Amino acid sequence: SMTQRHAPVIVIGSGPAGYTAAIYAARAMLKPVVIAGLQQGGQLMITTDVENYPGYAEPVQGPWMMEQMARQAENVGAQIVHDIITEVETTVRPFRLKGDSGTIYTCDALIIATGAQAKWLGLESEQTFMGGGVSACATCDGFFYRGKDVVVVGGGNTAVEEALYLSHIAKSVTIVHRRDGFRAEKIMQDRLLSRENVSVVWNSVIDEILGTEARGATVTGVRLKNIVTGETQERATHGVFIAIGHAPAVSLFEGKLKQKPNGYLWTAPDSTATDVPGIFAAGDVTDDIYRQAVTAAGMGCMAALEAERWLAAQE
C-alpha cells in the first residue's frame, strides 16, 4: 500500500456528517479525502425506513440515501478511501493519521465525523425484530406507534427523554430499567413518572423480545426478568425502544482532544472547532442532544466552512 499520502482536508467517517463535510470541502477546492471506516455510509446503513430527512417526498431506505451522498461527494471532487484510521497525531503539523492499511495520511485540517452508535442489549431477538417493533430512536419511529403500547428500555437521561417523547404519541409507555430508580435529572424524571400513561418496571431487564415468525417478524411482547430474584414475567407490547445510551467513537482522541463528561467530543458553541486549532468534529461524535441525520449533515457543512476559513488564516 501507499507509504504516505497528503490531502489538504481529511474527513474521518462516511456518514451524513462526513459526506457533507466532503461535499463542501471539495467545492472549496480543498481536495478532501474521506476515510470510510468499517461502515461506509454510517449508522443509516441499518435502517430501511427514513422519513424525516428533509428533501425526499416519500420514505427512503438508509442505504439508498447514503449512496446518493457518496455519489454526490465523488461527483464534486471528494475521494473516498476504504481504510480505517487507527491512530491520530494531534500535536503535529500537518496532522498525521495511520491507517489499518499501514498508510500514513497527512492533512492540513482534519474533520472528525466518526459518529456515536446506539448501544443495544445484545439479544438475538433485537436483530430478529429490528425495524419490526425494535428501534433505538423514538424520534425516528415513534410516529408509527400512535395509540399503541410500547416499552422503553433504560434509565438514564436518554431513556427518560425517549419515554417522555413517546408518552405524548403512544397510548402507553412501560419503562424497564435494571436499577431501582432513574439515573437522570430529577425534574425530568418527576415529569415523566407523573404522566398517567407511563408505568415503570424497576430492577428488571429484557430477557427476550417475543413476536411472530419472519414471513417481517413483528413484536408482540416481552419477557422481563427481575435481576434481584430472577423471576420472569411476560407481557404484551407493540414496540420496544432501546434507550440505554450511545457510544461516541472517540477511542482515537481520548487524552488528545477535550471531551465532555459523557465521552462525546467537545466542540465550541455554534461551531465544530475542538480544542486543537485545525481539528473539527461534526455529527454524533460531538452532538449528544439532537442526533439526527440532518443535524449531522449540517455540522458537516459547518466543519468544512470552518476548515476552509482556518486554512486561509494559516496561509
Ligand X SMILES: Cc1cc2c(cc1C)N(C[C@H](O)[C@H](O)[C@H](O)COP(=O)(O)OP(=O)(O)OC[C@H]1O[C@@H](n3cnc4c(N)ncnc43)[C@H](O)[C@@H]1O)c1[nH]c(=O)[nH]c(=O)c1N2
List, by residue number, the catalytic residues. Answer: 137, 140-141
* CA–CA gap between residue 20 and residue 218 (Å, rounded): 35
Check: CB of residue 206 under 8 Å from CB of residue 123.
Answer: yes
Contact string 63-92 vs ligand X (x = CB under 6 A): ---------------------xx-------
* CA–CA gap between residue 163 and residue 53 (Å, rounded): 22
Check: CB of residue 35 under 8 Å from CB of residue 59.
Answer: no
Q: Of 72-80, 218-226, 257-265, 273-281, which segment contacts its own copies by CB under 8 A?
A: 72-80
Contact string 40-59 vs ligand X (x = CB under 6 A): x-xxx-xx--x-xx------
| Integer CA distances (angstroms), 2 to 31, 39, 41, 135, in order | 18, 22, 24, 41
Write down the least CB distance from residue 141 to ligand X, Å.
Answer: 7
Q: Of 75-83, 144-152, 165-173, 267-275, which segment contacts Na ion by CB under 5 A?
A: 267-275
Site for its own copies in 196-215 (CB under 8 A): none
Q: Is 137 in the site for its own copies (CB under 8 A)?
A: no
Closer CB to its own copies, 199 or 290, in the complex: 290
The 10 Å Cβ neighbour count of residue 106 is 18
Write down the least CB distance from residue 267 to ligand X, Å.
Answer: 12
Q: Choose among 4, 34, 29, 30: nearest CA to 17.
A: 34
CA angle (165 as vertex; 163, 170 as ends), nearest 5: 80
Q: Is 12 in the site for ligand X (CB under 6 A)?
A: yes
For ligand X, the binding residues (CB under 6 A) are 12-18, 35-40, 42-44, 46-47, 50, 52-53, 84-85, 113-115, 118, 136-137, 140, 249, 252, 283-284, 291-294, 296
